[PDB]
Design a protein around this ligand. Structure first.
Ligand SMILES: CCn1cc(NC(=O)C2CCC2)cn1
Length: 171
């Protein structure tokens, strides 16, 4: 059975219990913590690409109001985000299972750009999701996994200094 797990879940849970925030810039900003996934149960010899996208967790705008995050009252349907291809893709099952698959080079932006950078809406809450795509073979296959532990609000600057402090303490 194909098993997908989150590396460093206990750290992600520290961020999550404060409401995690990720900075977005015009040119795009890398994530901290980095999404790292433990994968087992692949065919060592089969061919796979690792894809990353961000699901709008709800249809609302969020605002930091008197030291706490609160959703607006005006739901807007959230278009799905663009997909980031892990740069080691495409690659053998063995490659993907020998060390945690680390998305250290994805950059989160607030502006439509050449591409590579993933555009998110500022003050929307996001749930990271991967797709493991079996490629090359006749029969294609996808397996998808969400990481609730890694939810965050996209922000142009940090609102909760408790987050600012955790980011510095562990980077
Ligand atoms: C990072 C190098 N790279 C990989 C691709 N495309 C794929 O792997 C396709 C299989 C479905 C997505 C394009 N560039």
């Amino acid at each position: 059975e194909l098993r997908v797990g989150l590396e460093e879940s206990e750290l992600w849970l520290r961020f999550k219990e404060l409401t995690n925030e990720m900075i977005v810039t015009k040119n795009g900003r890398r994530m901290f913590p980095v999404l790292k996934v433990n994968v087992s149960g692949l065919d060592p010899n089969a061919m796979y690409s690792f894809l990353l996208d961000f699901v709008a967790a709800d249809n609302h705008r969020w605002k930091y109001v008197n030291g706490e995050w609160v959703p607006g009252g005006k739901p807007e349907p959230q278009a799905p985000s663009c997909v980031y291809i892990h740069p080691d893709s495409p690659n053998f099952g063995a490659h993907w299972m020998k060390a945690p698959v680390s998305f250290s080079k994805v950059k989160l932006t607030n502006k439509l750009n050449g591409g590579g950078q993933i555009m998110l809406n500022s003050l929307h809450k996001y749930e990271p999701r991967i797709h493991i795509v079996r490629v090359g073979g006749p029969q294609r296959m996808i397996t998808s996994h969400c990481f609730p532990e890694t939810q965050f609000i996209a922000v142009t600057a940090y609102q909760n200094e408790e987050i600012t402090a955790l980011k510095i303490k562990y980077n």
